[PDB]
Design a protein around this ligand. Structure first.
Ligand SMILES: [Zn+2]
Ligand SMILES: [Zn+2]
Length: 104
């Protein structure tokens, strides 16, 4: 076997532009213990007043006011007596995956 012609018909050297190669080694997926909730699967939760279920807090200082994400709940709308032990209330963790089917 031997050859060496040209044509430049199609391009099948690299993959699409969107799907960047080696995006990021580290793997981040939705927690499993809390299922992307941020609390222990064996604990209860309390209603937050600061935001009132909106996850938004307001800082009234003088003739002006500021706006920052609730601190008591953390922009959730409720107080987690016991925050997850895997994601520590992050909503995502490291899920060792090989393929990782986006759609599904
Ligand atoms: Zn709150
Ligand atoms: Zn978790």
């Amino acid at each position: 076997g031997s050859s060496g012609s040209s044509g430049m018909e199609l391009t099948f050297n690299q993959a699409a532009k969107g799907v960047n190669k080696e995006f990021t080694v580290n793997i981040m997926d939705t927690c499993e213990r809390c299922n992307g909730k941020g609390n222990e699967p064996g604990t209860k939760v309390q209603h937050c007043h600061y935001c009132g279920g909106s996850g938004m807090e307001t800082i009234n200082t003088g003739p002006f006011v500021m706006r920052s994400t609730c601190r008591r709940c953390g922009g959730r709308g409720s107080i987690i007596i016991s925050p997850c032990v895997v994601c520590r209330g992050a909503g995502q963790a490291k899920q060792k995956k090989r393929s990782g089917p986006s759609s599904g």
